[PDB]
């Protein structure tokens, strides 16, 4: 459990609010010493907000953004090759309604019989994984 003093928070830092990893977008401060923190959920874009004592600390989530080679897609699951040479099978395609789902399927199909490979960018935190970009390699 990594923490930062609330009084050391900056806009753009990462915090956990209601279990959600967020980028800080606004910090308000008040003998009384209380703070209001608003953030953007790194996966869904939703606004979250919390109020804690300024003296206190707040949890900072670990968030990874890495690139992988897309080996297969099957029943909505992906098989990915890390840049260090191992497979991961816990990343699904983005959900229906996220246009990235079609973008990844289509780029995979453009590449499947060619000497190019799709590279996906995956955002990961606390067991949640989302494909946030794709490009040709």
**Which CATH number characterizes residue 104's domain?**
2.40.50.140
Contacts of 44 (CB under 8 A, 6+ apart): 20
14/36 same-domain check: yes
End-to-end Cα, the chain, rounded Å: 37
69/121 same-domain check: yes
Method: X-ray
Q: What's this structure's resolution in Å?
A: 1.4
68/127 same-domain check: yes
Tokens 């099978």 correspond to 89
Give the DSSP letter string of 2-45: -EEEGGG--TT-EEEETTEEEEEEEEEE----EEEEEEEETTT-
Strand, coil or helix: 101:
helix
What pairs with residue 17 in β-bridges?
20
Q: Is 62 exposed, middle or buried (0-12, 13-18, 19+ CB in 10 A)?
A: exposed
């Amino acid at each position: 459990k990594a923490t930062i003093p609330v009084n050391k928070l900056k806009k753009g830092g990462y915090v956990l609010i209601e279990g959600r990893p967020c980028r800080v977008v606004d910090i308000t401060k008040s003998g009384h010493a209380k703070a209001g923190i608003a953030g953007t959920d790194l996966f869904t874009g939703r606004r979250y907000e919390t109020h804690l004592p300024t003296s206190h600390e707040i949890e900072v989530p670990f968030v990874d953004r890495s690139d992988y080679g897309l080996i297969n897609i099957d029943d909505g699951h992906t098989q990915l090759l890390t840049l260090d040479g191992t497979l991961r099978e816990d990343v699904d395609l983005p959900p229906e309604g996220n246009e990235m789902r079609q973008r990844v399927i289509d780029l995979f199909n453009v590449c499947v019989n060619t000497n190019d490979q799709v590279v996906v960018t995956v955002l990961s935190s606390n067991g949640e994984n989302l494909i946030v970009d794709c490009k040709k390699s």
